[PDB]
């Protein structure tokens, strides 16, 4: 298990900036421009633009508030007339350089419209969201805009008894079929294109009630599954309907342990500058005895792309004579490949779309969108798991060191409103910080990472407001030692200025900076005064940041034992001297001690000369 | 003067409709379709199959892709008068239905052409 975080930063001391609107909550969708400059929020009947850079300071803003009349008829369907019975935005997408795509629950009428970016007023579009949008602010949801065409994946209906993923094309529009082997009982997560003969593809994640495992109760299983972009649907049969539809399990677990996290929470997709395939960063929390712990899982595109394209499928089969069995599926298997994309190979055999498959592909993939093997994490293990902690949404940042070691950043907030900053060391997590983004303990619902070049941020939303973070505090490290330990491929200390920089950001010479994430503080270079009456009490304040580190203390260059009579501590890190006289007098010595390695690291935290007057 | 049976060669009955306003009865069997007086005399048949057909395969059954095509019996699965129409839905070809004139059971109206998965009504099994 993952340690506790090194550095506990309250909402008080450090530099967070904070947004929100009077009388207007639930602030779930948020977007950022093509620019950066301006981050979009969507609230409960609300739409505001922000500057991304201040989000305090206030752009545009637009409401969609409903109606008494369509409050009263939402109430009247037994549903709660001030809670549920309002406009939730659900959808807030790009759709071009003056527009956004905007939808909202709306009283249980999930509406969609245009949102015009030069006026900041709406279009009146009122188009029907049913099927893009949740009627249910409870209800999942997931969209991504592709192409200026909605792929999204919630429920088709009231009750939340249809799910669906589907396209609101309307040259092509395709949907999921409502059959138990193609999606059971589903909870959406996150949706993503993977760009590229070859066509794009269009992946979505969820956890839904598992049929190829049984146990005491329903177990749920995270997915992975996709879509090919240029999908048409079948001609004769899947008549608008997905022909490239395939799923599979998406693994997170550590099993010498026992530990199996089955209920996905989030996805990001580490687009790497360097690397030339994404990386998947799954966050997870077991369904079974959450108390809480969440696990984060690291997936290589790859690995899921190889399962799809060339993976044996499921197949389902009676059992006696009335129950259904899953299993693995040994026997032929069509050409074209069932549930491939219209490829290079495709186009050889004259396959111009899906329009013009054979009958036998189409119905093999609508009697098989199940795959049989599992999508597992890379190095076969989470790349943290952690206990006492109920994690809500991810953000990974691949950041370069001094030394020129990349780091994957992972930023995980919290059902308590919480950041943690967390990067896989030497085969050990190393959790650097964590930050309380909000003094409500609002669980973070959503997050944002912005990683470009000046606008450095991370943007939470709750329902009671927005939060704007930066990656790193390198300034709030005071010494080298403090600076180096601290082990932030962000952070690195600058001798001429004497200050903690943060490196890929500062205008600090890159040659005379120091860095070292071994902890190794020993690549740097190296008295408040108390007058107090006889007889009286003295409190010698001393503290630091490390929740990995104790302090104790020294006295006349000897370790003092804080015991009673003459000597106690508050709060374990004040040293109470009880009865001063003549002896007493002199330099007192609050020290740090903290295990990096094998080693340990003093340090002097506080220095005291104490004088008791006669 | 007028039948008291009805005993068709070659064949199985399936199903009996008769129409509410003229009294004519209409016969679902085995590869066939009669139409009746109310006094039982045939006043017209209908061939309805043998047809080349696979459970497998999607209407319209082409040879090339559904080689498993073999010469299949068309039981009727269901014979319905209809104020327009006679409704006939077989056990053939995914359970395509079709509509035919009421008293002129050979006058076929509507037989959609290029039929899809929507379509498909009755049991594609007898
Ligand atoms: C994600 O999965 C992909 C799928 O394989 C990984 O890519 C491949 O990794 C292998 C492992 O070495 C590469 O093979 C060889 O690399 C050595 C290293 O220099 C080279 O000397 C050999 O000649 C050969 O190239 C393979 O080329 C590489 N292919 C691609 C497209 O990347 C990828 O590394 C995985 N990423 C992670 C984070 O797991
Ligand atoms: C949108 O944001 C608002 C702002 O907090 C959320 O309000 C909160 O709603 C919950 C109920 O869902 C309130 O809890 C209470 O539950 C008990 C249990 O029966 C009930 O008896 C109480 O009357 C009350 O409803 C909570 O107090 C309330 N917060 C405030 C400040 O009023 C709202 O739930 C969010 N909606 C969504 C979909 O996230
Ligand atoms: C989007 O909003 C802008 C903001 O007003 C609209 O711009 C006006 O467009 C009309 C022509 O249609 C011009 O005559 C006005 O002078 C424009 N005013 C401004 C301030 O630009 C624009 O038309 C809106 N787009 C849509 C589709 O409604
Ligand atoms: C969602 O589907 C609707 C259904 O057609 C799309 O509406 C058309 O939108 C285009 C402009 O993009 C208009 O020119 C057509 O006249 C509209 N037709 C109808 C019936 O509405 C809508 O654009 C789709 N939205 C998205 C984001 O994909
Ligand atoms: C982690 O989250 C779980 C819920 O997923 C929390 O458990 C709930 O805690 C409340 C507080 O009293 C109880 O009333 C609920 O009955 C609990 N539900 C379940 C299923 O246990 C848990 O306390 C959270 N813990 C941490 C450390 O965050
Ligand atoms: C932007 O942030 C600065 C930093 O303190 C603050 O002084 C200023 O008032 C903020 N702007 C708005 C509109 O709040």
Same mark, same amino acid.
């Given at each position: 298990?993952?340690?506790?975080?090194?550095?506990?930063?309250?909402?008080?001391?450090?530099?967070?900036?904070?947004?929100?609107?009077?009388?207007?909550?639930?602030?779930?969708?948020?977007?950022?421009?093509?620019?950066?400059?301006?981050?979009?929020?969507?609230?409960? =009947?609300?739409?505001?633009?922000?500057?991304?850079? @201040?989000?305090?300071?206030?752009?545009?803003? %637009?409401?969609?508030? %409903?109606?008494?009349?369509?409050?009263?008829?939402?109430?009247?369907?037994?549903?709660?007339?001030?809670?549920?019975?309002?406009?939730?935005?659900?959808?807030?997408?790009?759709?071009?350089?003056?527009?956004?795509? *905007?939808? $909202?629950?709306?009283?249980?009428? !999930?509406?969609?419209?245009?949102?015009?970016?030069?006026?900041?007023?709406?279009?009146?579009?009122?188009?029907?969201?049913?099927?893009?949008?949740?009627?249910?602010?409870?209800?999942?949801?997931?969209?991504?805009?592709?192409?200026?065409?909605?792929?999204?994946?919630?429920?088709?209906?009231?009750?939340?008894? #249809?799910?669906?993923?589907?396209? @609101?094309?309307?040259?092509? !529009?395709?949907?999921?079929?409502?059959?138990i082997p193609?999606?059971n009982?589903?909870?959406?997560?996150?949706?993503?294109?993977?760009?590229? &003969?070859?066509?794009?593809?269009?992946?979505?994640?969820?956890?839904e009630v598992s049929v190829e495992y049984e146990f005491?109760?329903?177990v749920?299983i995270?997915r992975?599954?996709? *879509?090919?972009?240029?999908?048409?649907?079948?001609?004769?049969?899947?008549? +608008?309907?997905?022909?490239?539809?395939?799923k599979a399990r998406?693994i997170?677990?550590? !099993?010498?342990?026992?530990?199996?996290?089955? *209920?996905?929470?989030?996805?990001?997709?580490?687009?790497?500058?360097?690397?030339?395939?994404?990386?998947?960063?799954?966050?997870?929390?077991?369904?079974?005895? @959450?108390?809480?712990?969440?696990?984060?899982?690291?997936?290589?595109?790859?690995?899921? #792309?190889?399962?799809?394209?060339?993976?044996?499928y499921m197949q389902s089969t009676? %059992? =006696?004579?009335?129950?259904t069995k899953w299993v693995r599926?040994? &026997?032929?298997?069509?050409?074209?490949?069932?549930?491939?994309?219209?490829?290079? #190979?495709?186009?050889?055999?004259?396959?111009?779309?899906?329009?013009?498959?054979?009958?036998?592909?189409?119905?093999? %993939?609508?009697?098989?969108?199940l795959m049989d093997d599992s999508?597992?994490?890379?190095?076969?293990?989470?790349?943290?798991?952690? +206990?006492?902690?109920?994690?809500?949404?991810?953000?990974?940042?691949?950041?370069?060191?001094?030394?020129?070691?990349?780091?994957?950043?992972?930023?995980?907030?919290?059902?308590?409103?919480?950041?943690?900053?967390?990067?896989?060391?030497?085969?050990?997590?190393?959790?650097? =910080?964590?930050?309380?983004?909000?003094?409500?303990?609002?669980?973070?619902?959503?997050?944002?990472?912005?990683?470009?070049?000046?606008?450095?941020?991370?943007?939470?939303?709750?329902?009671?407001?927005?939060?704007?973070?930066?990656?790193?505090?390198?300034?709030?490290?005071?010494?080298? =030692?403090?600076?180096?330990?601290?082990?932030?491929?962000?952070?690195?200390?600058? !001798?001429?200025?004497?200050?903690?920089?943060?490196?890929?950001?500062?205008?600090?010479?890159?040659? $005379?900076?120091?860095?070292?994430?071994?902890?190794?503080?020993?690549?740097?270079?190296?008295?408040?005064?108390?007058?107090?009456?006889?007889?009286?009490?003295?409190?010698? +304040?001393?503290?630091?940041?490390?929740?990995?580190?104790?302090?104790?203390?020294?006295?006349?260059?000897?370790?003092?034992?804080?015991?009673?009579?003459?000597?106690?501590?508050?709060?374990?890190?004040?040293?109470?001297?009880?009865?001063?006289?003549?002896?007493?007098?002199?330099?007192?010595?609050?020290?740090?001690?903290?295990?990096? +390695?094998?080693?340990?690291?003093?340090?002097?935290?506080?220095?005291?000369?104490?004088?008791?007057?006669? | 003067?007028?039948?008291?049976?009805?005993?068709?060669?070659?064949?199985?009955?399936?199903?009996?409709?008769?129409?509410?306003?003229?009294?004519?009865?209409?016969?679902?069997?085995?590869?066939?379709?009669?139409?009746?007086?109310?006094?039982?005399?045939?006043?017209?048949?209908?061939?309805?199959?043998?047809?080349?057909?696979?459970?497998?395969?999607?209407?319209?059954?082409?040879?090339? /892709?559904?080689?498993?095509?073999?010469?299949?019996?068309?039981?009727?699965?269901?014979?319905?008068?209809?104020?327009?129409?006679?409704?006939?839905?077989?056990?053939?070809?995914?359970?395509?239905? /079709?509509?035919?004139?009421?008293?002129?059971?050979?006058?076929?109206?509507?037989?959609?052409?290029?039929?899809?998965?929507?379509?498909?009504?009755?049991?594609?099994?007898?």
């Amino acid at each position: 298990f993952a340690p506790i975080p090194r550095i506990t930063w309250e909402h008080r001391e450090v530099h967070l900036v904070q947004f929100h609107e009077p009388d207007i909550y639930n602030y779930s969708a948020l977007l950022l421009s093509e620019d950066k400059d301006t981050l979009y929020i969507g609230a409960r =009947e609300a739409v505001f633009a922000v500057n991304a850079l @201040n989000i305090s300071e206030k752009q545009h803003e %637009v409401y969609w508030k %409903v109606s008494e009349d369509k409050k009263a008829k939402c109430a009247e369907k037994g549903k709660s007339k001030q809670t549920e019975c309002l406009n939730y935005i659900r959808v807030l997408q790009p759709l071009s350089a003056t527009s956004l795509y *905007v939808c $909202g629950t709306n009283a249980f009428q !999930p509406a969609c419209d245009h949102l015009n970016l030069t006026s900041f007023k709406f279009l009146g579009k009122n188009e029907d969201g049913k099927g893009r949008c949740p009627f249910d602010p409870a209800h999942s949801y997931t969209s991504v805009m592709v192409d200026g065409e909605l792929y999204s994946g919630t429920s088709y209906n009231f009750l939340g008894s #249809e799910p669906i993923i589907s396209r @609101n094309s309307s040259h092509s !529009p395709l949907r999921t079929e409502y059959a138990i082997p193609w999606l059971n009982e589903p909870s959406f997560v996150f949706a993503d294109v993977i760009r590229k &003969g070859e066509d794009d593809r269009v992946y979505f994640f969820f956890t839904e009630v598992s049929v190829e495992y049984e146990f005491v109760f329903r177990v749920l299983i995270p997915r992975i599954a996709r *879509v090919c972009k240029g999908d048409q649907g079948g001609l004769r049969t899947l008549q +608008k309907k997905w022909t490239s539809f395939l799923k599979a399990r998406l693994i997170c677990s550590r !099993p010498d342990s026992g530990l199996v996290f089955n *209920v996905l929470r989030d996805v990001f997709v580490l687009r790497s500058p360097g690397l030339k395939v994404p990386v998947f960063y799954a966050l997870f929390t077991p369904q079974l005895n @959450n108390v809480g712990l969440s696990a984060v899982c690291a997936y290589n595109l790859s690995t899921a #792309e190889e399962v799809f394209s060339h993976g044996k499928y499921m197949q389902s089969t009676t %059992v =006696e004579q009335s129950h259904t069995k899953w299993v693995r599926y040994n &026997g032929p298997v069509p050409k074209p490949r069932p549930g491939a994309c219209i490829d290079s #190979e495709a186009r050889a055999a004259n396959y111009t779309s899906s329009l013009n498959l054979p009958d036998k592909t189409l119905q093999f %993939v609508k009697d098989h969108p199940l795959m049989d093997d599992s999508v597992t994490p890379i190095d076969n293990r989470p790349r943290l798991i952690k +206990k006492d902690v109920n994690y809500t949404q991810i953000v990974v940042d691949r950041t370069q060191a001094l030394d020129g070691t990349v780091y994957d950043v992972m930023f995980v907030s919290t059902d308590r409103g919480a950041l943690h900053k967390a990067i896989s060391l030497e085969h050990a997590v190393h959790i650097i =910080e964590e930050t309380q983004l909000f003094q409500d303990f609002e669980p973070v619902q959503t997050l944002l990472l912005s990683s470009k070049k000046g606008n450095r941020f991370v943007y939470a939303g709750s329902n009671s407001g927005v939060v704007q973070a930066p990656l790193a505090f390198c300034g709030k490290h005071g010494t080298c =030692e403090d600076c180096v330990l601290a082990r932030d491929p962000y952070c690195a200390w600058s !001798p001429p200025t004497a200050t903690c920089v943060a490196l890929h950001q500062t205008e600090s010479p890159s040659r $005379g900076l120091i860095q070292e994430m071994s902890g190794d503080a020993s690549v740097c270079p190296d008295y408040r005064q108390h007058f107090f009456k006889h007889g009286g009490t003295a409190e010698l +304040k001393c503290s630091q940041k490390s929740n990995l580190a104790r302090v104790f203390w020294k006295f006349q260059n000897g370790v003092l034992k804080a015991e009673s009579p003459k000597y106690g501590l508050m709060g374990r890190k004040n040293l109470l001297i009880f009865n001063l006289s003549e002896g007493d007098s002199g330099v007192y010595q609050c020290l740090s001690e903290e295990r990096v +390695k094998n080693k340990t690291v003093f340090q002097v935290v506080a220095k005291h000369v104490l004088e008791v007057k006669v | 003067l007028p039948p008291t049976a009805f005993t068709p060669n070659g064949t199985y009955l399936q199903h009996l409709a008769r129409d509410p306003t003229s009294g004519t009865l209409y016969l679902g069997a085995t590869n066939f379709l009669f139409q009746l007086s109310p006094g039982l005399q045939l006043e017209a048949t209908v061939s309805t199959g043998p047809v080349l057909d696979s459970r497998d395969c999607l209407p319209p059954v082409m040879p090339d /892709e559904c080689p498993q095509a073999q010469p299949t019996n068309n039981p009727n699965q269901l014979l319905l008068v209809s104020p327009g129409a006679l409704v006939v839905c077989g056990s053939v070809h995914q359970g395509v239905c /079709e509509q035919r004139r009421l008293g002129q059971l050979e006058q076929l109206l509507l037989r959609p052409e290029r039929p899809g998965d929507t379509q498909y009504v009755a049991a594609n099994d007898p």
